[PDB]
Amino acid sequence: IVKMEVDYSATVDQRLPECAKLAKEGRLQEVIETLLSLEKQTRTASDMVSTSRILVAVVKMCYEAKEWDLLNENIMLLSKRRSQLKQAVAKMVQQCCTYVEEITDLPIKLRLIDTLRMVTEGKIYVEIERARLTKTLATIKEQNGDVKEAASILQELQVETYGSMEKKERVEFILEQMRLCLAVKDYIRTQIISKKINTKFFQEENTEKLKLKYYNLMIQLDQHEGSYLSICKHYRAIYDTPCIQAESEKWQQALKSVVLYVILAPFDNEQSDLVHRISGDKKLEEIPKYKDLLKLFTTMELMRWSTLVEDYGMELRKGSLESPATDVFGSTEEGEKRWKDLKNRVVEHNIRIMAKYYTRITMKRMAQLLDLSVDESEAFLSNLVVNKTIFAKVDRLAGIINFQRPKDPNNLLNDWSQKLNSLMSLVNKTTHLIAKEEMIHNLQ
Amino acid sequence: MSHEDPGNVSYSEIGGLSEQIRELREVIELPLTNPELFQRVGIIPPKGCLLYGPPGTGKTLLARAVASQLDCNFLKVVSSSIVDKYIGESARLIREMFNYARDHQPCIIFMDEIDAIGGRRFSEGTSADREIQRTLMELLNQMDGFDTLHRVKMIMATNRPDTLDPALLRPGRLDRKIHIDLPNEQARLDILKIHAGPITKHGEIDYEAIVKLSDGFNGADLRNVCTEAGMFAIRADHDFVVQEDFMKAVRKVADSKKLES
Amino acid sequence: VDERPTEQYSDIGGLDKQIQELVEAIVLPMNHKEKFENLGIQPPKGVLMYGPPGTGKTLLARACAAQTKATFLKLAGPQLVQMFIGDGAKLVRDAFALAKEKAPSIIFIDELDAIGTKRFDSEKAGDREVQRTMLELLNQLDGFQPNTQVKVIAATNRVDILDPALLRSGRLDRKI
Amino acid sequence: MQSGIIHAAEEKDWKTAYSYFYEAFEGYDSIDSPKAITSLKYMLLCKIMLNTPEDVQALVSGKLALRYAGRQTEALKCVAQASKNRSLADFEKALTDYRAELRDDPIISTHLAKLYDNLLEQNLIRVIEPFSRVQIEHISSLIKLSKADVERKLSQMIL
Amino acid sequence: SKMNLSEEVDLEDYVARPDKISGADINSICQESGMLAVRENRYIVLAKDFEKAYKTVIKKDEQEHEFY
Ligand SMILES: Nc1ncnc2c1ncn2[C@@H]1O[C@H](COP(=O)(O)OP(=O)(O)O)[C@@H](O)[C@H]1O
Numbered sequence A: 001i002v003k004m005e006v007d008y009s010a011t012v013d014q015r016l017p018e019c020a021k022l023a024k025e026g027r028l029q030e031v032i033e034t035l036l037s038l039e040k041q042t043r044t045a046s047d048m049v050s051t052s053r054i055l056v057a058v059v060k061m062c063y064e065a066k067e068w069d070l071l072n073e074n075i076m077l078l079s080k081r082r083s084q085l086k087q088a089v090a091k092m093v094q095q096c097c098t099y100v101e102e103i104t105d106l107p108i109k110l111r112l113i114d115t116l117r118m119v120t121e122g123k124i125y126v127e128i129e130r131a132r133l134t135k136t137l138a139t140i141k142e143q144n145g146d147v148k149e150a151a152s153i154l155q156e157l158q159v160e161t162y163g164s165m166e167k168k169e170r171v172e173f174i175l176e177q178m179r180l181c182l183a184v185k186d187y188i189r190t191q192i193i194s195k196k197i198n199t200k201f202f203q204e205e206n207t208e209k210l211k212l213k214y215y216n217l218m219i220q221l222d223q224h225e226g227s228y229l230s231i232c233k234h235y236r237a238i239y240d241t242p243c244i245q246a247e248s249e250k251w252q253q254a255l256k257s258v259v260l261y262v263i264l265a266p267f268d269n270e271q272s273d274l275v276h277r278i279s280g281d282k283k284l285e286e287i288p289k290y291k292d293l294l295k296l297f298t299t300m301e302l303m304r305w306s307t308l309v310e311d312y313g314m315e316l317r318k319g320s321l322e323s324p325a326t327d328v329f330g331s332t333e334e335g336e337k338r339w340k341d342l343k344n345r346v347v348e349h350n351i352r353i354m355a356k357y358y359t360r361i362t363m364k365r366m367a368q369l370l371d372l373s374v375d376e377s378e379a380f381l382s383n384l385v386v387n388k389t390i391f392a393k394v395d396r397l398a399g400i401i402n403f404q405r406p407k408d409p410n411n412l413l414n415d416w417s418q419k420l421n422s423l424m425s426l427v428n429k430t431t432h433l434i435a436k437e438e439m440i441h442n443l444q
Numbered sequence B: 001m002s003h004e005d006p007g008n009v010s011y012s013e014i015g016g017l018s019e020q021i022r023e024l025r026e027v028i029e030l031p032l033t034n035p036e037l038f039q040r041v042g043i044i045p046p047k048g049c050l051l052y053g054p055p056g057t058g059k060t061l062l063a064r065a066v067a068s069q070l071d072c073n074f075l076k077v078v079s080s081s082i083v084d085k086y087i088g089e090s091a092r093l094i095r096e097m098f099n100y101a102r103d104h105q106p107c108i109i110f111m112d113e114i115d116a117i118g119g120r121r122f123s124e125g126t127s128a129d130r131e132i133q134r135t136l137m138e139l140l141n142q143m144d145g146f147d148t149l150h151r152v153k154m155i156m157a158t159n160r161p162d163t164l165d166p167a168l169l170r171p172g173r174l175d176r177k178i179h180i181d182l183p184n185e186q187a188r189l190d191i192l193k194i195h196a197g198p199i200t201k202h203g204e205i206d207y208e209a210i211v212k213l214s215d216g217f218n219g220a221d222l223r224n225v226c227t228e229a230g231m232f233a234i235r236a237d238h239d240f241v242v243q244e245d246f247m248k249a250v251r252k253v254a255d256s257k258k259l260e261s
Numbered sequence C: 001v002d003e004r005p006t007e008q009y010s011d012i013g014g015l016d017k018q019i020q021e022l023v024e025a026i027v028l029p030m031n032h033k034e035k036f037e038n039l040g041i042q043p044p045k046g047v048l049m050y051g052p053p054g055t056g057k058t059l060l061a062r063a064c065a066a067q068t069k070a071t072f073l074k075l076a077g078p079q080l081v082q083m084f085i086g087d088g089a090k091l092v093r094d095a096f097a098l099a100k101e102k103a104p105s106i107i108f109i110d111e112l113d114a115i116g117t118k119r120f121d122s123e124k125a126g127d128r129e130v131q132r133t134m135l136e137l138l139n140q141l142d143g144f145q146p147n148t149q150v151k152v153i154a155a156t157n158r159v160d161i162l163d164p165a166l167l168r169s170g171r172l173d174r175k176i
Numbered sequence D: 001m002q003s004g005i006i007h008a009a010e011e012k013d014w015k016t017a018y019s020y021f022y023e024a025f026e027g028y029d030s031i032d033s034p035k036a037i038t039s040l041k042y043m044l045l046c047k048i049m050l051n052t053p054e055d056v057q058a059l060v061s062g063k064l065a066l067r068y069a070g071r072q073t074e075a076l077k078c079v080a081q082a083s084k085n086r087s088l089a090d091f092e093k094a095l096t097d098y099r100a101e102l103r104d105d106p107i108i109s110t111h112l113a114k115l116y117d118n119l120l121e122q123n124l125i126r127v128i129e130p131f132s133r134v135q136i137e138h139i140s141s142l143i144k145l146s147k148a149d150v151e152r153k154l155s156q157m158i159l
Numbered sequence E: 001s002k003m004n005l006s007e008e009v010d011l012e013d014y015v016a017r018p019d020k021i022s023g024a025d026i027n028s029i030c031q032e033s034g035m036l037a038v039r040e041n042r043y044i045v046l047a048k049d050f051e052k053a054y055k056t057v058i059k060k061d062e063q064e065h066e067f068y
């Protein structure tokens, strides 16, 4: 930073070990003070290596003489005296980081927070921040997982993540803080941090247990409130990893989970695209989920869930691995919530497929097909129409429904004329065909 | 824009202080790559970094090479060329060049010489008083040039960081400075090796003896050393270059710089 | 532009060591260009003859061009200061273009001291506009690095009147 | 405050009325208590009229709002939570629970009645799409109201 | 005020200091300074944003004490 004026390498070499011997157990503070004077001299002479060596020797003396409080105020004075040399203080903090990790003790939490306070005066991206990150992680480990330190590691990560990350260390730190966030069971902030970090991909092509760990922490976060499409998307994103690391149990359970979720997702064009892309997988055929998807994807079949719970419901009781199945529906509270989600999901699926087939269907038959009563069926019909998914008009006093838009006479006669022109073109084509075949057949 | 991204393979052609190159890349690239995170969390990305070593290792060479991981277009702009007339309206030229960077959004403005000859002659304190510093404050308040939106940084390749207006090193200022000096023995032998790379002759790999005679010689001087070895060989009209040619080149350049200094 | 100079090296002299040095630095990269090519060292291009007038820089340059038997283009430096905006920049651009289009040429720019100031800025003047032309020449110096052809020869009296920007390994380097 | 009043009566935009009311209250910061109360009441009324009661909680949790807290302020907070719940019945309940506190005809009763009509219309339109023909007592049952008032509102809408 | 209190500007920002400049600063410049609250690191605006807005594009004209 600033040019060296007067070096004291000879002085420190000749005196520092003698000082260490003179205060082997650290009972003398005059030694600390005189090395402070020497390093002040070298600082006014603008020497960095001598000051760094003096600070390292001071903290080493404090280590060997185990005076924890005097260490705390000593390092406070060192970091606050005039700021000294940024290189030297970054060094001293680094050896303090190396030391605090080896002795368990009770007040090493106090040591960690003291160094955190010394480094949090600023100068984070500049002059070492990995030390502060490691100290926060060490605090996490010391407190064994709680909400306060989880919030701390939440609010710490951003500056270093933006400034100077590591393709492995920084992302592992992010993964080790998001899991604490989810353990705290905060959802808004955990969602925010997950969505702000997941923009950094194109390293997962060489992941070992990193993309899968991220995804298996964010599964709970998404599925906790209402997510069902991102659920299937990142479950297939964890499915494609056993493709390069073919391990049968995890592979097959991921297949089961993704097949279940993609069907369970609310109906949309994108969900249709995903289900059609999923269907036809050569490696998907050997599981009952193959039959489940083939039945429940297309051809507008009557998805009577009362029948399905035994026709294709064997995944709840016993299947090949049935572990994702037991996670989804075999659970008690969230399991029954997902059971109800299957129930309604199939109700809207039946309503939708009935929309494109039956114009007017009686209320009793529709309720019986939806496995509910008249009022529940009309409530779900209202829930669809307010979402504009279906064009439905109901007479409630008569309880009769219609799905066809009233045909305006303009386009009615237009399609009539188009039918006429189709017939005319058919007349032309048939005339040419029969005349020419007549020619070939009377060539005799 | 005059200099563009292609030809950015100098990451191996720099040789010396590869750790320094790595540190500058670590400082620069991430906001240059994904600045949106900085807006997303509410933190200001850095503006650039300062480079020392007035005649030493190629600061412009580093500017070219570090943009390898950046896929950006380095621009070699001169402080005098930016200030033109000695008026505060010199900001018009900086506006034009920043608009050029904005058009070629992935860009890094490499400054040529801000502390005009930091080793001697007139510094920031002498000659033009505060004109340089006010023009730099113009680019300083430019920092709100949509840093989140704009993939533009500015590297300050000064000669000597001695007279650099310490008011321009506070947070929000240029901030980061990376230390570059005359190459050490290791960097010197490495850059000698990379200079000799294109040269395929009999010679030897006796690089340490060459280093011994040519210690404290800048990277440009060592490139000139290799060129002088080639010149000696061709003046002899010899298709061979031996360590004696290297000795002659090193002695020639050493005597030349000794007389010129 | 002289199509071909006929002045011979024998009629000039006195500075024979310097003239042989610049011959090795310029004419040899023209005749034995393949020699440099197979060696792997690209010859330098920027040669700056500094010295009081009457020292034969012009005759030496034209004789060198004749020995190269290549194209020679002379630039009248002192009259490159035109009131028209970017006029000198355009002149330099098209001069380099012509040299590139016509053989490995000799770009003999005179009055390099007139072209470039020592940045001794003052209230009377500060070389505001001519700096555009100086930068244009600087940016044109690197155009012919591959196939090292078209050499640059700048003649002046006092080298010290120039800033340490034109002086570089790839730029003007051979100060004679 | 008067500019906010005029703009709130104009009803083309309420965010500028919010700005003016907040400026008036900031002028009335612990200086004139009744004018401050009126300014904050109008500010919160236009804030809920913006159909954004989510910021109401923060606004009433602000230091000055707690300083000038009162029964009318709590009634307005209850009105905001009724708007959150989209329950015209809850809005009417809050108005009855604090009637005299919000009975003021100038830009208090008028705007509360306008908002009540807005919730009535929104509830009816939100529940009316499926039905090509529905019995009005069923509609009243869904809206949790009597028959005469629901019929009168649906009429006044359709006339 | 157009941008509602500069989109919820903080109280400690008042223009009394950055307006009594006697530095021309035409209404166009005033609007540009107002929109120079585009620093979206936070949801509010501080006096620092106004100071930067006034600092950018400005010419130094002062010295009324001699005339008064
Ligand atoms: N470490 C190096 N490795 C290879 N070439 C170098 C090195 N340092 C300098 N050079 C050569 O010097 C020339 C210009 O360097 P420059 O950027 O002017 O250095 P400085 O700015 O320190 O004088 C380049 O063409 C480059 O080839």
Ligand SMILES: Nc1ncnc2c1ncn2[C@@H]1O[C@H](COP(=O)(O)OP(=O)(O)O)[C@@H](O)[C@H]1O
Binding pocket: C011, C012, C013, C014, C051, C052, C053, C054, C055, C056, C057, C058, C059, C155
């Ligand atoms: N070595 C020389 N031999 C013959 N004539 C010379 C020599 N040096 C200079 N001259 C004369 O000088 C004139 C060129 O002057 P000029 O080129 O302006 O000098 P400089 O190049 O030093 O400015 C020519 O007409 C030539 O006759």
